Amino acid sequence: MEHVAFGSEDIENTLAKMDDGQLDGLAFGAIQLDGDGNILQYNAAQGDITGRDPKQVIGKNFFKDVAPCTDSPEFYGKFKEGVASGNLNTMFEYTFDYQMTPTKVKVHMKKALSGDSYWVFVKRV
Ligand SMILES: *C(=O)/C=C/c1ccc(O)cc1
């Protein structure tokens, strides 16, 4: 188990050292997106929450293909403003309900340290 707490102030520095195997040891769901919303990384805890198979969703677009319930001003709209501005750090509750039992989660979106990548972190509430 990797010990990093959800919501930690310097989480992007800590997660910069992990490969996909290490990300699978986190206590919470983690998705890495490019600035178009394509999925680059998707960990085991996220798949436990959503039912998706991690290897199968890498390369898909999160907003168009995987998670249409997030294509809303309340989720996608926040992401796209962050990508446009080059800064993003926001936490909110949301319900995931596409092809699954409706599940309430806490979401933390934060710009990654390097380049044009963005984290989505998720835990149950
Ligand atoms: C709504 O369509 C949410 C879907 C969803 C959220 C997060 C995931 O990792 C996968 C699907």
UniProtKB/Swiss-Prot annotation:
Swiss-Prot/TrEMBL keywords: Chromophore, Photoreceptor protein, Receptor, Sensory transduction
InterPro entries referenced in this protein's UniProt entry, alphabetically: PAS, PAS-like_dom_sf, PAS_fold, PYP
PAS domain segment(s): 23-86
Coiled-coil regions, chain positions: none
tRNA processing as UniProt keyword: no
Post-translational modification summary for this protein: The 4-hydroxycinnamic acid (p-coumaric acid) chromophore is covalently bound via a thioester linkage.
Homology family: Belongs to the photoactive yellow protein family.
Known partners and oligomeric status: Monomer.
Function: Photoactive blue light protein. Probably functions as a photoreceptor for a negative phototaxis response.
Name of the protein in question: Photoactive yellow protein
Organism per entry: Halorhodospira halophila
Lineage of the organism: Bacteria, Pseudomonadati, Pseudomonadota, Gammaproteobacteria, Chromatiales
Gene name of the record: pyp
